[PDB]
Amino acid sequence: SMNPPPPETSNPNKPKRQTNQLQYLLRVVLKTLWKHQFAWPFQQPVDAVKLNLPDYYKIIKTPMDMGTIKKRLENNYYWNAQECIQDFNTMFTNCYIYNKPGDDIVLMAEALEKLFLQKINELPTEE
Numbered sequence: 001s002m003n004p005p006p007p008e009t010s011n012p013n014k015p016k017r018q019t020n021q022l023q024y025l026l027r028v029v030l031k032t033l034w035k036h037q038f039a040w041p042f043q044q045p046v047d048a049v050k051l052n053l054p055d056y057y058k059i060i061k062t063p064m065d066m067g068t069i070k071k072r073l074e075n076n077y078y079w080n081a082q083e084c085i086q087d088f089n090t091m092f093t094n095c096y097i098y099n100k101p102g103d104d105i106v107l108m109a110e111a112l113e114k115l116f117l118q119k120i121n122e123l124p125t126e127e
């Protein structure tokens, strides 16, 4: 079984805007999480082929990762901050769905998520 194509990251048939919340999600939230010591497994789609996890995309039908989030922010793919926040949440929930609760990767994800939520609770007000 091969990997599915990545999530869509660019669409010209979608309206474009820059907002201070979206800027903050890229420049502060994504940047912070990306540099975190546990970020590495979440920086690109799960390569189920390379990792030998043939069951991954049988279980995870809404894949998401921070590489995809980065491209989406870069390409002005999101109109609303909540679209991006949803993608971060999808990434975390996917990890919790797929892996056993005691797995190293789950505990790593939990630490990343704690950080994520700290940065999200400080989301600047709509300018």
Ligand SMILES: CO[C@H]1CNC[C@@H](OCC2CCC(F)(F)CC2)[C@@H]1Nc1ncc(-c2cncc(C)c2)c2cc(C)c(=O)[nH]c12
Residues within 6 Å of the ligand: 040, 041, 042, 046, 047, 051, 052, 053, 094, 095, 098, 099, 100, 103, 104, 105
């Ligand atoms: C069936 O195994 C999965 C569930 N248990 C936890 C992880 O198990 C340890 C790996 C070790 C390496 C292996 F090849 F032998 C396969 C078992 C497994 N889940 C996951 N394993 C690896 C990754 C990962 C992806 N990219 C880079 C790295 C360094 C690791 C991931 C990543 C995510 C997001 C995930 O949900 N599960 C993973």
